[PDB]
Amino acid sequence: GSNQNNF
Numbered sequence: 001g002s003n004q005n006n007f
């Protein structure tokens with residue numbers, strides 16, 4: 001699946 005990191 002797809003991954004997003006929003007710091």
Ligand SMILES: [Zn+2]
Pocket residue numbers: 001002003
């Ligand atoms: Zn994946």
